[PDB]
Structure formats: structure tokens, C-alpha cells
């Protein structure tokens, strides 16, 4: 389909291929700590459509600095893997770190 004037082709690829993690059309959920390495195992298929390992890292940084991502990192919320499986909880220190980032972004 049409592609927009400013976009992340890497994040579009991630949302198409791992919607449980990167499709936020309805909701957004905390991601497994270290999900970047899980993503990098799929780098070959991304490279076939011109998506580089660096751009995949860039896309994950973009996603996880969204205010809506930072706001979903509340203590005891469930972290999911690339396929939506629960793996861990957001800790109190992780929650605190996210609330400080939000407060600084919104000040």
C-alpha cells in the first residue's frame, strides 16, 4: 500500500511480523527485557526487504520511548515476548524509572 512521507520501515516490519509486541492499534504492553536479541535472530528475513540490524535497533528505541509505552510500565504489569507470551513482571524500580522519564518528557 501507500507509504507515508515520514516513517520507520523497520518498525512497520516489526509490527507486521510480531504484532503481539509491536501492534498498538488497540493496546500496548511491556516488553521482555532483552527482546532486542530475540528480534535479532530474525535479522535475515528483515535484510531481505532492506531492513538493517541497526534500523531494527532504532525501531525498538522509537517504540519504547513512546509516552504510551512508558506509561504502561507500571509495577506488576506483565512483560511479554515477541509472540505475546508472559515472561516477567515490571518491577518497582523499572516503574519508577519510567515515571521519571515521563515526568521529564511532559514537564
Numbering used by the authors: 19 to 125
Paper text:
The ProQ/FinO family of RNA binding proteins mediate sRNA-directed gene regulation throughout gram-negative bacteria. RocC binds and stabilizes RocR, which in turn binds and represses a series of mRNA targets that encode components of the DNA uptake system.
We carried out further truncations to define a minimal RNA-binding region of RocC that would be amenable to structural studies. However further deletion to residue 24 resulted in a ~threefold reduction in binding affinity, similar to what we had observed by EMSA, and a total loss of transformation repression.
